[PDB]
Design a protein around this ligand. Structure first.
Ligand SMILES: CC[C@@H]1Cc2cc(O)ccc2C2=C1c1ccc(O)cc1C[C@H]2CC
Ligand SMILES: CC[C@@H]1Cc2cc(O)ccc2C2=C1c1ccc(O)cc1C[C@H]2CC
Ligand SMILES: [Cl-]
Lengths: 234, 10, 232, 10
């Protein structure tokens, strides 16, 4: 595995170069949104984002070393977590709003257009404000995104390799903090702060998944094959 | 796990 | 807050001393259990454990410094995660089984007696195996349990965040004292905290399952347990 | 509101 041989700076480089592009939402949507029209716009975006996510995963060091069955499993378990953290990252510089796409910046009020959605929007906004306060950097963000992919479904030959890569990502994060001039104590504290956020992201994903299976039965969500399969995986 | 399978193979 | 001035050693001692007692399940020789009898035993135990959890929380450095409203919010969000990590901890000595109580050691097969429960038993057994292989120490366990209490509902705060950094310092202190290199220390720290996201996942799955058990009226739920459930 | 939790916490 060339992954286990990468240095910290090479790890950061590989992850930064693997970043997916930012996609646009269907243009000139009719406002205000109806429950069905908003979900239509968001599900359309998510479906296209999933295609890019699958290809981003293949570029995450070590992921290629896993079996197709495992790769499928990790993505099925982590896709929504990955969509959410990307959203929280794009929204950092926009207090109070969620930047779903450059041409689609929504406020919590618009989240009331869909039953049960405002609760999820609020958690997402709190996470974004948390990253803002922490002044989360781009190199740290890509590290966290890769940890989500490898850790979310990890729970022996395959497991050991995954744990080794996770350990390398940890080393990378500490490396970045050391360069930022943080003391040893501050490095450990920030590392803990960042990893504990992943607990909240897992929570939002579990809640989002339940709410998604809720909109589904109400025939409010469009029939986007990939998105539906990913949802059925749960 | 159909489409995802194929996309991961391509 | 008095908790912020404590040393790592005092923090560990405080946490160890606040540990709740191990409770026993109601006694009954009859095996195997039925869906209702098993759920009856488990909910009765959970309800009694919750009372001790509340008193344990009050002894967690920094918790009493919060307002009643905040204390309530934290317990409501974290109660199942706390019950689960406790179960995973005492089940470490018994690979392959879940020690709900000294007189109630269950196996995966017994998890099938209740629909939807085997999936949860399996996640819990894997977590226990993970802790067993990492050779989790009692001192690290008490820190993790406290982190769950203070972190789970924190985003739904400067004081709580300051207490969390304190526990982090304590965890590293314990690893350094155990002889781990600087590298092994931050790698072990990350490993431990990542398992917390899995505990969060199990809690959400367990909460969903309990809600459905409730609506299916498989068994009446005790008042405290119902309060904690409805909070979700 | 009246909660058993409130009572036990105080
Ligand atoms: C509410 C946003 C959350 C995360 C997210 C990020 C993104 O970049 C694009 C779409 C989404 C979805 C979410 C979600 C949140 C709750 C749900 O019930 C379903 C979903 C699925 C999609 C929207 C179709
Ligand atoms: C399956 C064990 C899990 C955690 C646990 C630890 C413990 O020390 C005592 C009771 C429990 C419960 C659990 C659970 C798991 C799934 C559920 O739907 C409900 C519950 C609530 C109680 C059992 C009544
Ligand atoms: Cl596109």
């Amino acid at each position: 595995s060339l992954a286990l041989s990468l240095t910290a700076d090479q790890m950061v480089s590989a992850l930064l170069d693997a970043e997916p592009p930012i996609l646009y939402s269907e243009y000139d949507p009719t406002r205000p949104f109806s429950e069905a029209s908003m979900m239509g716009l968001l599900t359309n975006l998510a479906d296209r984002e999933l295609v890019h996510m699958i290809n981003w995963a293949k570029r995450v060091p070590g992921f290629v070393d896993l079996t197709l069955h495992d790769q499928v499993h990790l993505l099925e378990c982590a896709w929504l977590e990955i969509l959410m953290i990307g959203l929280v990252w794009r929204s950092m510089e926009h207090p109070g709003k969620l930047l779903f796409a450059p041409n689609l910046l929504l406020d919590r009020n618009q989240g009331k257009c869909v039953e049960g959605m405002v609760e999820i929007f609020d958690m997402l906004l709190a996470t974004s404000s948390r990253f803002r306060m922490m002044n989360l950097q781009g190199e740290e963000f890509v590290c966290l995104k890769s940890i989500i992919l490898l850790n979310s479904g990890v729970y022996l030959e395959e497991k050991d390799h995954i744990h080794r890569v996770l350990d390398k990502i940890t080393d990378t994060l500490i490396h970045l903090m050391a360069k930022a001039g943080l003391t040893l104590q501050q490095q450990h504290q920030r590392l803990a702060q960042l990893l504990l956020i992943l607990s909240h992201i897992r929570h939002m994903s579990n809640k989002g998944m339940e709410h998604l299976y809720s909109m589904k039965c109400k025939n409010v969500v469009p029939l986007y094959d990939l998105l539906l399969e990913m949802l059925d995986a749960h | 796990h159909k489409i995802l399978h194929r996309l991961l193979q391509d």
